């Protein structure tokens, strides 16, 4: 048998339903989610890290000139200094006074730390959504396996067959371009591998962590070695990646709405709460017993003992019944006024049973069906003492969940009396018109 | 930090995150006098019950000045076919019941 | 690279090829690649057949 419905996109809140095969006893059904992961499709563009500029040994011609060509290196620099006359240990290095030449070339490359901490640049696209469901039905225990949230694919669990419907919202916390540095994820824009302004984010752009070609502009410039000392000095702007790690705001796993915890190894967005998920479950035909082998109850009267507003199961009710035989049959409230803590009861011959429920109304007007027989329950509820709890609400608050009986009496008085005060006015002009018409003849 | 019924989470230092939700306690009492009813709904809704309070007195003011533009017009048609000719005997139903101005002469 | 940002050095010049005026692509959302020819085909999506 196939049962279709719509479940909401909440994780810890179970969905309860009562399937009704004709000619057979009803079977309780319980679907619960564990995970909900949105997995966008990403492709790496470039990584970035702190640079490390190496300087080769300069050549010191004693008297002459040595020019350099152009080398295929990122941010390569050449500048020839004339007339240096350097000193080393053990006397002066050169002889030809006031006519000398120093090479002093410099070159920018990736640091050794770039294999460990590096920000990875991605663009995302819409990909797969998958979840993890928990299923029980009848007398079968809990079974769980991860499904795919597309209408087309079925995933069997136990002996059933579940088709989780598509999500009704295409919302995703990720932007078009993201930066994944270390543990956290940032919503950011890139200089698109061509540009980089030497001090913000893209002063070193490498397409792969082991790539050979490298882009780097760090405003490298060489300076004159002074006072006859053999060294190659240079001034350049500091690293933009080192600056970005100071001046970055909050990561996406602290800003994302709906409580989406962001994971990393497939770059997921776990456990969001938006929209609703349709369902369809193929219950096996061997789980349905014949209706004649079940108790048939009658003369049900339900009185709600104590009720309250609270997020947990704060309502207690008792049902007095009378049954033909002793057995088990599930209970379920089809309305949204209350949810039921219990799933089934053990019956006898003309006894009683009690159950726990949670609601948001002052006056609950729900009904529940036990042993394919229904009974209505009414009552009153009280405000709870607790101000803040640490668990989500089991129920769903509606638009008219706050209006009491006394507040609706003032709604009807303020509407009924003032509308009828115009009806008295409108019937007054239709009477004196009739009186003046009868004065005409 | 203001916590609504949707929830709020906070991380302090290197501690794991903690989530808290707000219940619907309130301060007032809905089953009582009209000053007690409004106070309870003002704390629960501080954004909707100040509009519906102004709307309900806007409709009442409109419906009151609509009716007295029609009750006084009707009473102005009681007097104009009787006060013109004072010799006509005014019936006893129109003196007090149907319209307010009583008999004389 | 055809985007208005990345420059390329062709000899001693520097060319920045701007973005295309149309975002038209011949491929559909789902394609099937058999041999050396592509097809604009839909999918049974791994659960159906």
């Amino acid at each position: 048998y196939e049962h279709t419905a719509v479940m909401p996109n909440k994780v810890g809140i179970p969905y309860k339903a009562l399937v009704e095969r004709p000619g057979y006893a009803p079977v309780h059904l319980q679907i619960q989610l564990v995970n909900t992961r949105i997995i966008p499709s990403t492709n790496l563009e470039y990584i970035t890290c702190k640079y490390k500029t190496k300087v080769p040994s300069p050549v010191v011609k004693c008297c002459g000139a040595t020019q350099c060509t152009s080398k295929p290196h990122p941010d390569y620099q050449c500048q020839v200094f004339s007339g240096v006359y350097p000193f080393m240990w053990g006397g002066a290095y050169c002889f030809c006074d006031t006519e000398n030449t120093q090479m002093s070339e410099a070159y920018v490359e990736r640091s050794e730390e770039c294999s460990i901490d590096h920000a990875k640049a991605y663009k995302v696209h819409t990909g797969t959504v998958q979840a993890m469901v928990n299923i029980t039905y009848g007398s079968v225990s809990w079974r769980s396996a991860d499904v795919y949230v597309n209408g087309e694919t079925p995933a069997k669990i136990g002996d059933a067959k579940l088709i989780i419907g598509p999500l009704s919202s295409a919302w995703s916390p990720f932007d078009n371009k993201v930066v994944v540095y270390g543990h956290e994820v940032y919503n950011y824009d890139f200089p698109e591998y061509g540009t980089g302004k030497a001090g913000s984010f893209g002063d070193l752009q490498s397409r792969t962590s082991t790539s050979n070609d490298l882009y780097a502009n760090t405003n490298l410039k060489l300076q004159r070695p002074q006072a006859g000392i053999v060294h190659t000095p240079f001034t350049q702007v500091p690293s933009g990646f080192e600056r970005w790690k100071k001046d970055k705001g909050a990561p996406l796993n602290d800003v994302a709405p709906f409580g989406c915890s962001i994971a990393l190894e497939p770059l997921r967005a776990e456990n969001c709460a938006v929209g609703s998920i349709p369902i369809s479950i193929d219950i096996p035909d061997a789980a349905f017993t014949r209706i004649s082998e079940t108790p048939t109850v009658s003369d049900l009267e339900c009185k709600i003992t104590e009720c309250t507003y609270a997020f947990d199961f704060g309502g207690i009710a008792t049902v007095a019944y009378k049954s033909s035989k002793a057995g088990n049959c599930p209970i379920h409230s089809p309305s949204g006024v209350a949810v039921i803590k219990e799933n089934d009861v053990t019956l006898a011959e003309s006894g009683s049973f009690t159950f726990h429920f949670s609601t948001a109304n002052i006056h609950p007007a729900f009904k529940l069906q036990v042993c394919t027989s229904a009974v209505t329950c009414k009552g009153d509820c009280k405000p709870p003492k607790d101000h803040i709890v640490d668990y989500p609400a089991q129920h769903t608050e509606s638009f008219t969940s706050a209006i009491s009986a006394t507040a609706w009496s003032w709604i009807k008085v303020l509407v009924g009396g003032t509308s009828a005060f115009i009806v008295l006015g409108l019937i007054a002009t239709a009477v004196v018109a009739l009186v003046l018409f009868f004065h005409r003849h | 930090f203001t916590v609504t019924g949707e929830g709020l989470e906070y991380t302090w230092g290197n501690h794991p995150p903690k989530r808290v939700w707000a219940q619907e306690s309130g301060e007032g009492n809905p089953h009582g006098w009209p000053h007690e009813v409004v106070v309870y709904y003002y704390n629960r809704y501080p954004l909707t019950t100040i509009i519906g309070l102004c709307t309900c007195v806007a409709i009442i003011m409109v419906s009151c000045v609509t009716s007295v533009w029609l009750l006084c017009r009707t009473r102005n048609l009681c007097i104009t076919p009787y006060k013109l000719a004072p010799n006509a005997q005014v019936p006893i139903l129109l003196a007090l019941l149907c319209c307010i101005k009583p008999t004389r002469a």
Side-chain angles (χ1 to χ4, degrees), chain A, chain B:
Chain A
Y1 199 75
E2 195 235 15
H3 171 52
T4 82
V6 168
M7 106 183 302
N9 194 10
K10 316 295 295 211
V11 175
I13 306 312
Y15 169 74
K16 308 199 198 235
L18 214 73
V19 299
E20 304 230 57
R21 210 176 165 184
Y24 295 84
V27 160
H28 206 241
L29 185 97
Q30 223 181 317
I31 326 187
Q32 216 190 36
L33 292 168
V34 180
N35 289 326
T36 303
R37 331 182 282 276
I38 293 163
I39 317 179
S41 99
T42 56
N43 53 336
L44 184 74
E45 310 218 339
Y46 61 95
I47 81 162
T48 170
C49 49
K50 207 205 201 151
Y51 50 83
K52 168 182 72 47
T53 85
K54 99 160 284 181
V55 280
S57 272
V59 308
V60 191
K61 186 65 178 181
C62 263
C63 39
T66 38
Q67 310 333 94
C68 53
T69 40
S70 170
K71 306 226 208 215
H73 284 333
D75 221 2
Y76 186 73
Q77 288 266 316
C78 261
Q79 203 194 100
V80 167
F81 306 97
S82 40
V84 278
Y85 192 48
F87 273 66
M88 293 221 73
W89 68 280
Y93 183 76
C94 267
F95 173 79
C96 315
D97 201 4
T98 73
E99 186 244 313
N100 280 260
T101 283
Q102 196 160 325
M103 201 66 267
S104 85
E105 53 209 291
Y107 158 57
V108 179
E109 69 147 358
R110 254 183 269 116
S111 34
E112 316 160 21
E113 291 107 4
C114 197
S115 54
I116 293 308
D117 46 348
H118 51 279
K120 310 218 282 301
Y122 286 113
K123 339 202 169 210
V124 314
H125 293 294
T126 89
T128 60
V129 197
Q130 30 198 299
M132 176 149 207
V133 288
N134 225 352
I135 303 301
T136 189
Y137 56 94
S139 86
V140 198
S141 46
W142 289 93
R143 205 68 68 84
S144 76
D146 41 353
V147 305
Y148 274 83
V149 180
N150 46 337
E152 330 307 2
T153 292
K156 103 162 297 185
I157 47 185
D159 274 39
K161 198 178 62 49
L162 177 63
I163 301 180
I164 272 283
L167 264 154
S168 43
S169 66
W171 181 88
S172 190
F174 303 112
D175 223 35
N176 209 40
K177 295 144 117 195
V178 290
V179 169
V180 180
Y181 170 60
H183 154 217
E184 47 251 15
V185 180
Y186 299 94
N187 268 359
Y188 202 50
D189 276 43
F190 318 134
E192 212 56 60
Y193 190 69
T195 82
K197 305 331 299 203
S200 43
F201 193 51
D203 63 329
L204 192 128
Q205 305 181 297
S206 149
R207 287 231 162 249
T208 321
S209 191
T210 174
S211 151
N212 270 39
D213 188 36
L214 180 88
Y215 169 79
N217 47 338
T218 62
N219 237 36
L220 186 54
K221 181 182 59 52
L222 306 140
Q223 312 285 90
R224 157 163 261 265
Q226 83 284 50
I229 304 166
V230 202
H231 70 274
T232 166
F234 59 97
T235 82
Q236 90 202 293
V237 316
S239 196
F241 176 73
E242 195 216 35
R243 181 172 97 119
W244 179 74
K245 293 199 296 205
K246 273 151 57 58
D247 308 351
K248 51 189 179 148
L252 205 51
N253 34 32
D254 302 323
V255 191
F258 307 109
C260 302
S261 50
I262 286 187
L264 207 52
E265 173 284 349
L267 196 78
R268 309 169 287 228
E270 272 183 288
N271 288 310
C272 298
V274 48
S276 78
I277 297 177
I279 40 153
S280 149
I281 168 153
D282 253 24
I283 304 191
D285 278 340
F288 291 94
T289 80
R290 279 306 202 126
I291 193 168
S292 60
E293 284 92 298
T294 39
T296 50
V297 315
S298 50
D299 283 328
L300 304 131
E301 191 76 329
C302 155
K303 165 185 57 67
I304 295 183
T305 300
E306 191 172 46
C307 174
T308 197
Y309 264 93
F311 272 11
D312 51 284
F313 292 116
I316 295 191
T318 47
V319 168
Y321 77 106
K322 156 195 302 140
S323 147
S324 75
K325 77 152 221 197
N328 278 34
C329 52
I331 67 174
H332 172 228
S333 157
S335 57
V337 198
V339 303
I340 317 291
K341 175 176 190 32
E342 275 84 14
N343 300 317
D344 46 350
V345 289
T346 72
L347 294 184
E349 295 245 29
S350 171
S352 165
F353 65 97
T354 165
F355 63 96
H356 302 259
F357 71 101
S358 165
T359 170
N361 292 87
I362 309 203
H363 318 299
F366 72 102
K367 55 171 279 285
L368 84 178
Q369 31 190 295
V370 50
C371 261
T372 178
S373 309
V375 51
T376 59
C377 301
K378 329 203 145 297
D380 289 334
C381 309
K382 336 200 61 162
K385 304 295 162 265
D386 229 355
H387 281 286
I388 277 179
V389 293
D390 49 348
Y391 38 82
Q394 293 268 8
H395 46 245
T396 50
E397 155 138 12
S398 188
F399 157 72
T400 167
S401 301
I403 311 164
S404 67
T406 314
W408 221 308
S409 293
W410 282 97
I411 274 148
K412 296 199 298 268
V413 157
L414 259 67
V415 160
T418 72
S419 180
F421 215 72
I422 324 175
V423 178
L424 173 78
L426 266 196
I427 213 178
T429 81
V431 156
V432 287
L434 193 100
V435 170
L436 291 199
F437 178 73
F438 273 44
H439 292 335
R440 294 275 337 253
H441 31 271
Chain B
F1 303 118
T2 167
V3 184
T4 168
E6 277 183 325
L8 168 136
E9 89 151 3
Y10 64 96
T11 85
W12 159 249
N14 291 313
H15 290 295
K18 257 168 271 291
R19 317 206 152 158
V20 283
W21 283 265
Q23 258 175 348
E24 280 281 81
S25 89
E27 318 177 8
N29 157 260
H31 310 115
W33 290 127
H35 65 92
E36 286 186 277
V37 175
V38 170
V39 155
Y40 167 72
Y41 287 127
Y42 183 48
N43 310 347
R44 209 204 174 117
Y45 308 111
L47 63 140
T48 326
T49 71
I50 214 63
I51 276 176
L53 261 206
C54 274
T55 280
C56 95
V57 312
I59 307 314
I60 275 185
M61 171 95 68
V62 157
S63 148
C64 180
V65 307
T66 280
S67 94
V68 304
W69 201 74
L70 263 66
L71 270 304
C72 262
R73 138 179 275 254
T74 292
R75 204 207 92 90
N76 226 25
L77 306 211
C78 281
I79 308 299
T80 185
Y82 275 81
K83 209 177 156 313
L84 277 176
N87 46 331
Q89 268 282 287
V90 187
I92 211 71
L93 214 80
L94 206 142
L96 186 134
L97 261 287
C98 274
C99 270
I100 311 312
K101 187 187 253 267
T103 168
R104 254 174 87 182

